[PDB]
Design a protein around this ligand. Structure first.
Ligand SMILES: CC(=O)SCCNC(=O)CCNC(=O)[C@H](O)C(C)(C)COP(=O)(O)OP(=O)(O)OC[C@H]1O[C@@H](n2cnc3c(N)ncnc32)[C@H](O)[C@@H]1OP(=O)(O)O
Ligand SMILES: CC(=O)SCCNC(=O)CCNC(=O)[C@H](O)C(C)(C)COP(=O)(O)OP(=O)(O)OC[C@H]1O[C@@H](n2cnc3c(N)ncnc32)[C@H](O)[C@@H]1OP(=O)(O)O
Ligand SMILES: *[C@@H]1O[C@H](CO)[C@@H](O[C@@H]2O[C@H](CO)[C@@H](O)[C@H](O)[C@H]2NC(C)=O)[C@H](O)[C@H]1NC(C)=O
Ligand SMILES: *[C@@H]1O[C@H](CO)[C@@H](O[C@@H]2O[C@H](CO)[C@@H](O)[C@H](O)[C@H]2NC(C)=O)[C@H](O)[C@H]1NC(C)=O
Ligand SMILES: *[C@@H]1O[C@H](CO)[C@@H](O[C@@H]2O[C@H](CO)[C@@H](O)[C@H](O)[C@H]2NC(C)=O)[C@H](O)[C@H]1NC(C)=O
Ligand SMILES: *[C@@H]1O[C@H](CO)[C@@H](O[C@@H]2O[C@H](CO)[C@@H](O)[C@H](O)[C@H]2NC(C)=O)[C@H](O)[C@H]1NC(C)=O
Ligand SMILES: CC(C)CCC[C@@H](C)[C@H]1CC[C@H]2[C@@H]3CC=C4C[C@@H](O)CC[C@]4(C)[C@H]3CC[C@]12C
Ligand SMILES: CC(C)CCC[C@@H](C)[C@H]1CC[C@H]2[C@@H]3CC=C4C[C@@H](O)CC[C@]4(C)[C@H]3CC[C@]12C
Ligand SMILES: CCCCCCCCCCCCCCCC
Ligand SMILES: CCCCCCCCCCCCCCCC
Ligand SMILES: *[C@@H]1O[C@H](CO)[C@@H](O)[C@H](O)[C@H]1NC(C)=O
Ligand SMILES: *[C@@H]1O[C@H](CO)[C@@H](O)[C@H](O)[C@H]1NC(C)=O
Ligand SMILES: CCCCCCCCCCCCCC
Ligand SMILES: CCCCCCCCCCCCCC
Ligand SMILES: CCCCCCCCCCCCCC
Ligand SMILES: CCCCCCCCCCCCCC
Ligand SMILES: CCCCCCCCCCCCCC
Ligand SMILES: CCCCCCCCCCCCCC
Ligand SMILES: CCCCCCCCCCCCCC
Ligand SMILES: CCCCCCCCCCCCCC
Ligand SMILES: CCCCCCCCCCCCCC
Ligand SMILES: CCCCCCCCCCCCCC
Ligand SMILES: CCCCCCCCCCCCCC
Ligand SMILES: CCCCCCCCCCCCCC
Ligand SMILES: CCCCCCCCCCCCCC
Ligand SMILES: CCCCCCCCCCCC
Ligand SMILES: CCCCCCCCCCCC
Ligand SMILES: CCCCCCCCCCCC
Ligand SMILES: CCCCCCCCCCCC
Ligand SMILES: CCCCCCCC
Ligand SMILES: CCCCCCCC
Ligand SMILES: CCCCCCCC
Ligand SMILES: CCCCCCCC
Ligand SMILES: CCCCCCCC
Ligand SMILES: CCCCCCCC
Ligand SMILES: CCCCCCCC
Ligand SMILES: CCCCCCCC
Ligand SMILES: CCCCCCCC
Ligand SMILES: CCCCCCCC
Lengths: 527, 527
């Protein structure tokens, strides 16, 4: 057939004699999208010979169909159904009143079977290895956490099996792909504090440390702009098409601000209910709350011309299509004002579900405030680890307290909903509730991973700390060699989830093995 | 206008009343090519109103034009002229007998002015640096030689300014681009001997050395097949389109054969007219002469179906177009027999001047014999360096003797001509005279570079030994980052020699600087 991946076939048979029909399609994942025309089925020329037309409907989310008489502009029937991948469905519209019935000709396939099988195979290997082994400075929990986030992004960037839950969410909500970048910012803040405390304890000067901070930030930004962003398979680089924002640029700016703050207000770690780690660093908290107030003010009060003030929405056909060019609101407006459309991201994640035409950069200028807030929460985690290193009970109690506080803030902001909160979770805007949700997840992960890996030693972090010790090499590496064999080959079927998933799992395992080889040879690159 | 790079405009005005004309074009660089149709000019409809037509003629080499009456198939006049780049020439054909005259409307540009200016600027910098400095184990000559060849290939591979003398020759003869690969094979043989002598003198076992040899050869071949050959900007790799031969594959096979021979017949270096370095290694010479006899026999006596036996020619329209699919002869036939057309090089250098349609691989199977012969001559150079290291006069005398012998052999084979010798110089076939010519050049280079750099110390090899100590990193590096900024940007004019030359010079200097940075940080990768 001609069905692409994640698409079903819908055959519409119109038995009505004197009324044409227009088939409108809306996805269930849209929040207030507009109905779009799917197919036009004419009237039946003679009784007993119904006119037909075929359309392809997406199967990732539920579908809502509305059949409207193209003359009277009225609705004859409306269906809400969830079509399955590669299915063959027939819809019959006939008199006696008009009622339209949906039937299944060919059953669909189970498209999530590769994911279920890949999890069971992975779980079966873990049990065998653990059972087989039974018969036979540098914190390791932070390396394990960073390596977990690394393995996840390599799977996600390489495609994720072309599954919708291993991709970035269109506008609002969370998928597996939306977790890894905030966790990298969190871990990078924690490592900022650990490194700076060690260096300033060895007696090193603050000005040489400042020089190292500036050099590392400049180097990260330059690598991001020149190596990671461009698609050089298209052609040589021209300035008018250069994308200035990006991932490594975000890390460089966040690292500079947070590292310079910590260096400026650095204090020796002194040697048990006490708020020492919090109150000893109150100037940072004051400045961070000032930045958070700035983000809220610019997001909810800045007037954007030709756009509602405080608009938190995708534009396109979203919000009933009233604001087709307002993708982002104040964040997008500031990006376009300072950098320009041609220096932004040309394929925002909302372009597929909301059909937005403007350029929006997820790593823009306004979200760097919340990137800095995430990194500073990571710094607080490092402070807990170092201040109370003698007592494990103190560390676990503080991690639990922070996780609970940030979780309650996220519940209040998002209202435990995807689109109906006061500040819904959104990776494109780097929302406040995005930061608090992912920070509570990071504190819970550290809560589980600290006693298991560091205190007791029940686990060593294998195989996660091998890329966790070469994160920058693995990141820049898979960006450079994304199209190379063995990370990518020509598939017998591009429309198969099984083949894409196998390819991406193999490539991710190859990067874990490359990082293990570098670790085994004691080759560690720090930017 | 619409002239591309290295093209002139030819306007033909036909004043003849009753005879059409057909304009045939042949290049002077062709050996026995066929005339190709350039443009068809009809007859003049009325006296005093001559019909005209415009054609673009290449300006890299001389042009031969033949005007033939399209009815009687006779020749009215024939011109041999050398058109200049971007010139505007008008050719008038008129009665009184018929004589055709060539006139220059717009003068051409001097297309080699950027090359002349780039040499003077380079020479002016050398004089300033040498004058300014005046006011203010590992052989260095081998590193300088390898670095010179490295700088040359990086300039050549990146385009060479799009100059025809910085590209590979079409079939026969030499350009600057055809010198660098044989010199790498020569230096690699010399380094084989130096390394093996040192290791076997330190008492290391021969079997562990054999393991190291096999590992290095396998690794070189794998890197060549997977990283260097494919164009991943086109798409993911499929087996049916994989090119098996290549540069690093050639180096791997040559290294394995030569290193295993030297290891097998290794002898300690003993401590002055004597042939000790030659006669102490007579088994290698016997085996090398046997391989050379094999190459000559398979090249001049193997019967290729549908092809003359011992054909040393490009096919295409060459040799008067009698053998359009015989590109290569026995070498190409063996390549196609063993590997197949779809696993060979799809754009041989002859495809532009001789219009060949078949696939030919310059790094094929039959030329590896001559690659091994070149590497073994390099081994002989290393033997001279180590046997007579005490006496500089002995080293210089032996280098001069070898250069003279190989030069005389090259003169005898090529007959001091491009196409008229018994075995003309040809990089595609890796001819015997190609090997002897480039070996005499390498021996002369070593003759000049040994007393200057090593014995006296007048020069240190700057800036050439910095990439000479990281050759593999520089090679694989510029292959991976060929399309990246700052090595390539979008030009304001793609048809300008000045802009291409500036871009390629800047990229080559950047690779010298990268290698200097690695040397300054003591980071050396040996494959
Ligand atoms: C959304 C998607 O799918 S793609 C988006 C995802 N983006 C990315 O993954 C970007 C890639 N980013 C990264 O890999 C990292 O965040 C980096 C490169 C910015 C660095 O993060 P960091 O945690 O700071 O890494 P790094 O190892 O360089 O840490 C630097 C310092 O921390 C120290 N450190 C790191 N881990 C630890 C640890 N566990 N304990 C103690 N010190 C540590 C290092 O010793 C070093 O200190 P030093 O230089 O004084 O000796
Ligand atoms: C046609 C075009 O335009 S493109 C075609 C051009 N192709 C290429 O350039 C291919 C690239 N090839 C190369 O760079 C090289 O030929 C290579 C990578 C194959 C290696 O060549 P080599 O000269 O053998 O390089 P390398 O430095 O690795 O030498 C290996 C050994 O020689 C030793 N060695 C190298 N130079 C010297 C020296 N001057 N003195 C003593 N020992 C030396 C090294 O110590 C090493 O020994 P070890 O491993 O026991 O310690
Ligand atoms: C299909 O027809 C229905 C009519 O039942 C349309 O629904 C109305 O649309 C108008 C706008 O033209 C609104 O003012 C009404 O409030 C809607 N509801 C009713 C009950 O009339 C619907 O818009 C049509 N579909 C499309 C895509 O235009
Ligand atoms: C979906 O199913 C219908 C049957 O329910 C298929 O329609 C048949 O198509 C074949 C060839 O196209 C005809 O020979 C049959 O007569 C059709 N049957 C009916 C009942 O119409 C349709 O082809 C299927 N679509 C697919 C498989 O893509
Ligand atoms: C142009 O015309 C000339 C005639 O002077 C052709 O030259 C002859 O070509 C025939 C082949 O058809 C040969 O047998 C003759 O030996 C050639 N020379 C002479 C003096 O007759 C020439 O081939 C024509 N050009 C092209 C491209 O066909
Ligand atoms: C080459 O030179 C001729 C003149 O020798 C140019 O022909 C002139 O073209 C312009 C515009 O096309 C006319 O206005 C003139 O009348 C033409 N002059 C003659 C004598 O024919 C021709 O355009 C030039 N070709 C280029 C510059 O590409
Ligand atoms: C001090 C901390 C808590 C907050 C810092 C940010 C404050 C001072 C700034 C940031 C952006 C500012 C807003 C920007 C633009 C407008 C629109 C204008 O028509 C009225 C003022 C108003 C609404 C500003 C109010 C003050 C504001 C919210
Ligand atoms: C011993 C050294 C000097 C030479 C080794 C190669 C010799 C033995 C081999 C290599 C290829 C061989 C040739 C391959 C094919 C043919 C065509 C056939 O119709 C007659 C024999 C003839 C002409 C062979 C003669 C011998 C030959 C030249
Ligand atoms: C998110 C899915 C990724 C699937 C691959 C996970 C990593 C598998 C590890 C394989 C390599 C192990 C090398 C280290 C062994 C000690
Ligand atoms: C074949 C033309 C290439 C032009 C560039 C030649 C190399 C220039 C050297 C510049 C970098 C010097 C770095 C080392 C300085 C000590
Ligand atoms: C249905 O559409 C056709 C166009 O092909 C039109 O001619 C016809 O009038 C329409 N039906 C009605 C009832 O108007
Ligand atoms: C020249 O070519 C034309 C085709 O356009 C043809 O009609 C004419 O006959 C030819 N000239 C002669 C002399 O045959
Ligand atoms: C490396 C191993 C990769 C395993 C992935 C399994 C893919 C799912 C197969 C589903 C079969 C229907
Ligand atoms: C898609 C909607 C996301 C809302 C998430 C709300 C929960 C925030 C964290 C809850 C506690 C986490 C403990 C691990
Ligand atoms: C000692 C070396 C100093 C290098 C300085 C390079 C420029 C630093 C700029 C960093 C700015 C990043 C945040 C905007
Ligand atoms: C005495 C040693 C000092 C070394 C340099 C430290 C100062 C670096 C300044 C960089 C500031 C960056 C601002 C963009
Ligand atoms: C050992 C000397 C300490 C003196 C204070 C050092 C403060 C360094 C932070 C400066 C922040 C400014 C960034 C541009
Ligand atoms: C030297 C001690 C002074 C105490 C100042 C008050 C500390 C305020 C801490 C702010 C934390 C609020 C966000 C968690
Ligand atoms: C001594 C510490 C023993 C391990 C305690 C682990 C606590 C993790 C809690 C996770 C809750 C789901
Ligand atoms: C690096 C410096 C590159 C110099 C190359 C000069 C190009 C030739 C210029 C010709 C002007 C007409
Ligand atoms: C294009 C024709 C090439 C023929 C070259 C013949 C000369 C061979 C070497 C001569 C002596 C070299 C001394 C440096
Ligand atoms: C000790 C490690 C040995 C590795 C062996 C790898 C295979 C070697 C094959 C090399 C063949 C190259 C010439 C055909
Ligand atoms: C005792 C140590 C021996 C180490 C291995 C040496 C033998 C390697 C054999 C490789 C041969 C390659 C042939 C293709
Ligand atoms: C120290 C032991 C020496 C014994 C002889 C070693 C010979 C090694 C060369 C073998 C060549 C075979 C390659 C496949
Ligand atoms: C002691 C050696 C002095 C230097 C001798 C250089 C010989 C090079 C000859 C080059 C001929 C053109
Ligand atoms: C800070 C690094 C900025 C790098 C900008 C690259 C610009 C490329 C344009 C060159 C082609 C005209
Ligand atoms: C057609 C699929 C073949 C590729 C399988 C994945 C590669 C695994 C080995 C990689 C080591 C170089
Ligand atoms: C010795 C290394 C050989 C590598 C061959 C790569 C083959 C790639 C084809 C996979 C896609 C079907
Ligand atoms: C438009 C041309 C601008 C590029 C000039 C070459 C780059 C030189 C600096 C490279 C260092 C990153
Ligand atoms: C999704 C987990 C898959 C684990 C596969 C591990 C074998 C390479
Ligand atoms: C590092 C060089 C940047 C050059 C930018 C030029 C913009 C047209
Ligand atoms: C003790 C110094 C505090 C300086 C003010 C903090 C906010 C800028
Ligand atoms: C502005 C409405 C309430 C916001 C929730 C507060 C969470 C701390
Ligand atoms: C310092 C620039 C990045 C180097 C490329 C690394 C590719 C794995
Ligand atoms: C062809 C030699 C040019 C030398 C230029 C050196 C300055 C980068
Ligand atoms: C290294 C894996 C090679 C796989 C080759 C498969 C040919 C179709
Ligand atoms: C002294 C051993 C020589 C072995 C024969 C050489 C040619 C195979
Ligand atoms: C076979 C004709 C003569 C070949 C020249 C010999 C050079 C040593
Ligand atoms: C070992 C494979 C090659 C690594 C890439 C190096 C790029 C500079």
């Amino acid at each position: 057939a001609e069905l692409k991946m994640d698409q079903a076939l819908l055959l519409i048979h119109n038995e009505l004699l004197w009324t044409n029909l227009t088939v409108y399609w809306k996805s269930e994942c849209c929040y207030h999208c507009l109905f779009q025309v799917l197919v036009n089925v004419p009237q039946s020329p003679k009784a007993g010979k119904p006119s037909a037309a075929a359309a392809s409907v997406s199967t990732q989310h539920g579908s809502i169909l509305q059949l409207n008489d193209t003359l009277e502009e009225k609705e004859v029937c409306r269906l809400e159904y969830r079509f399955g991948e590669f299915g063959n469905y027939s819809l019959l519209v006939k008199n006696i009143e008009i009622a339209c019935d949906l039937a299944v000709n060919e059953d669909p396939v189970d498209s999530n079977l590769p994911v279920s099988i890949a999890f069971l195979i992975g779980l079966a290997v873990i049990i065998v290895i653990s059972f087989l082994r039974l018969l036979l400075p540098r914190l390791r929990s932070v390396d394990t956490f960073r390596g977990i986030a690394l393995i996840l992004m390599v799977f996600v960037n390489y495609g994720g099996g072309k599954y919708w839950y291993f991709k970035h969410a269109s506008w609002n909500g969370l998928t597996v792909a939306d977790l890894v970048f905030p966790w990298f910012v969190f871990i990078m803040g924690s490592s900022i504090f650990l490194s700076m405390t060690s260096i300033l304890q060895r007696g090193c000067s603050k000005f040489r440390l400042l020089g190292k901070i500036a050099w590392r930030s400049f180097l990260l930004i330059c690598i991001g702009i020149i190596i990671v962003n461009p698609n050089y398979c298209l052609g040589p680089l021209s300035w008018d098409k250069v994308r200035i924002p990006g991932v490594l640029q975000r890390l460089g700016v966040t690292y500079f601000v947070v590292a310079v703050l910590e260096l400026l207000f650095a204090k020796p770690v002194p040697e048990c209910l006490s708020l020492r780690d919090i109150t000893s660093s109150w100037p940072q908290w004051l400045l961070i709350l000032v930045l958070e107030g700035l983000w809220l003010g610019l997001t909810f009060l800045l007037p954007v011309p030709g756009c509602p003030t405080g608009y938190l929405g995708p534009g396109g056909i979203g919000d009933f299509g009233k604001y087709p060019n307002c993708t982002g609101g104040a964040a997008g407006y500031i990006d376009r004002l300072l950098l320009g459309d041609d220096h932004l991201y040309q394929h925002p994640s909302s372009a597929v579900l909301y059909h937005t035409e403007v350029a929006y950069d997820p790593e823009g200028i306004l979200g760097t405030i919340n990137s800095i807030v995430m990194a500073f929460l990571g710094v607080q985690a490092g402070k807990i680890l170092l201040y109370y290193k003698a007592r494990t009970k103190d560390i676990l109690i503080r991690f639990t307290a922070w996780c609970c506080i940030l979780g309650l803030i996220s519940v209040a902001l998002t209202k435990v909903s995807e689109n109906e909160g006061f500040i819904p979770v959104n990776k494109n805007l780097w929302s406040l509730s995005y930061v608090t949700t992912l920070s509570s997840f990071a504190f819970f992960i550290l809560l589980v991973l600290y006693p298991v890996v560091d205190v007791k030693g029940l686990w060593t972090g294998t195989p996660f700390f091998y890329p966790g010790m070469n994160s920058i090499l693995v990141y820049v590496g898979h960006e450079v060699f994304e199209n190379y064999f063995p990370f990518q080959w020509k598939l017998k079927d591009n429309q198969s989830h099984k083949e894409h998933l196998t390819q991406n799992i193999v490539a991710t395992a190859l990067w874990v093995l490359i990082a293990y080889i570098l670790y085994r040879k004691k080759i560690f690159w720090k930017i």
